[PDB]
Design an enzyme around this catalytic site. Structure first.
Site, PDB file in Angstrom:
ATOM      1  N   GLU A 271     -22.277   3.010  -3.694  1.00 41.69           N
ATOM      2  CA  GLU A 271     -23.365   3.084  -4.269  1.00 41.69           C
ATOM      3  C   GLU A 271     -23.402   3.228  -5.736  1.00 41.69           C
ATOM      4  O   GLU A 271     -24.172   3.451  -6.425  1.00 41.69           O
ATOM      5  CB  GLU A 271     -24.121   4.084  -3.521  1.00 41.69           C
TER       6      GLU A 271
ATOM      7  N   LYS B  11       2.965   3.106  -5.867  1.00 42.03           N
ATOM      8  CA  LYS B  11       2.643   2.166  -7.067  1.00 42.03           C
ATOM      9  C   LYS B  11       3.368   1.882  -7.973  1.00 42.03           C
ATOM     10  O   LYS B  11       3.499   0.563  -8.496  1.00 42.03           O
ATOM     11  CB  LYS B  11       1.407   2.999  -7.368  1.00 42.03           C
TER      12      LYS B  11
ATOM     13  N   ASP C 285       0.975  -1.072  -0.080  1.00 40.72           N
ATOM     14  CA  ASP C 285       0.052   0.178   0.072  1.00 40.72           C
ATOM     15  C   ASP C 285       0.894   1.354  -0.008  1.00 40.72           C
ATOM     16  O   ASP C 285       0.328   2.227   0.366  1.00 40.72           O
ATOM     17  CB  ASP C 285      -0.865   0.017   1.468  1.00 40.72           C
TER      18      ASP C 285
ATOM     19  N   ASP D 187      -3.403  -2.890  -2.518  1.00 47.42           N
ATOM     20  CA  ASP D 187      -4.316  -1.858  -2.458  1.00 47.42           C
ATOM     21  C   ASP D 187      -4.309  -0.780  -3.266  1.00 47.42           C
ATOM     22  O   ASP D 187      -3.104  -0.608  -3.931  1.00 47.42           O
ATOM     23  CB  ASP D 187      -4.439  -1.205  -1.031  1.00 47.42           C
ATOM     24  N   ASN D 188      -5.347  -0.294  -4.009  1.00 47.14           N
ATOM     25  CA  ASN D 188      -5.633   0.744  -4.823  1.00 47.14           C
ATOM     26  C   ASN D 188      -4.961   0.055  -6.238  1.00 47.14           C
ATOM     27  O   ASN D 188      -4.184   0.730  -6.900  1.00 47.14           O
ATOM     28  CB  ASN D 188      -4.452   1.866  -4.362  1.00 47.14           C
TER      29      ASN D 188
END
Ligand SMILES: Cc1nn(C)cc1-c1cc[nH]n1
Length: 205
Positions: free
Chosen positions: A189, A134, A131, A159-160
């Protein structure tokens, strides 16, 4: 200041020695990450790692999240490049009562990973949470392999990881027979991905 504010909020509102209330305090403050944390929980519970390596600490949310599930004997190593974040993370762990389960190493992953065996007496890792930067995901994955720190069944969780980001890292773990891969996409959502994670289990050479 975001990390500092989060800590003070925990310090003022959470219950010392209670990792759940620390996590709830962080989540609550930030929203006006539980989808990611829930996946981290599931991985720890399934693979029951004895030694975990975390790359990137920030305010310590993930260190708390993971360490609270480790049983006596099981430990977490956390690397963090920013000494200000390492300090925050230490305070966060002290507050959660998890200080005996976590060791924080300050520095860059590419410098520290090669020193794990000799300098820090690591044999192999059971789990790695990525994490940090990147652009280091693939290089550090390769470095861990090449340094002999992975074993058959070692689980990487990154992650990500959301396409078209991390094209190289994904091309490798998916493309290689040495890794068995699962992807997670959280949309909340929405119709667009909010966070993505990749689980990659090393099959050995
Ligand atoms: C550890 C580490 N190593 N490198 C190269 C960056 C980090 C980091 C990124 C966020 N926190 N720590």
């Amino acid at each position: 200041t975001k990390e500092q504010r989060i800590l003070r909020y925990v310090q003022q509102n959470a219950k010392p020695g209670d990792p759940q209330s620390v996590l709830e305090a962080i989540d609550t403050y930030c929203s006006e990450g539980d989808a990611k944390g829930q996946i981290m929980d599931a991985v720890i519970r399934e693979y029951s790692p004895s030694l975990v390596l975390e790359l990137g600490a920030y305010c310590g949310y993930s260190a708390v999240r993971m360490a609270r599930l480790l049983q006596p004997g099981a430990r977490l190593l956390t690397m963090e490049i920013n000494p200000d974040y390492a300090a925050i993370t230490q305070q966060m762990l002290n507050f959660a009562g998890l200080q005996d389960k976590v060791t924080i190493l300050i520095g860059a992953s590419q410098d520290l990973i090669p020193q794990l065996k000799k300098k820090y007496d690591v044999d192999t890792l059971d789990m790695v949470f990525l994490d940090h930067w990147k652009d280091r995901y693939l290089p550090d994955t390769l470095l861990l392999e090449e340094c002999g720190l992975l074993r058959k069944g070692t689980v990487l969780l990154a992650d990500n990881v959301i396409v078209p980001g991390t094209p190289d890292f994904l091309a490798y773990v998916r493309g290689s027979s040495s890794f068995e891969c699962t992807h997670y996409s959280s949309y909340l959502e929405y119709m667009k991905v909010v966070d993505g994670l990749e689980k990659a289990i090393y099959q050995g050479p």
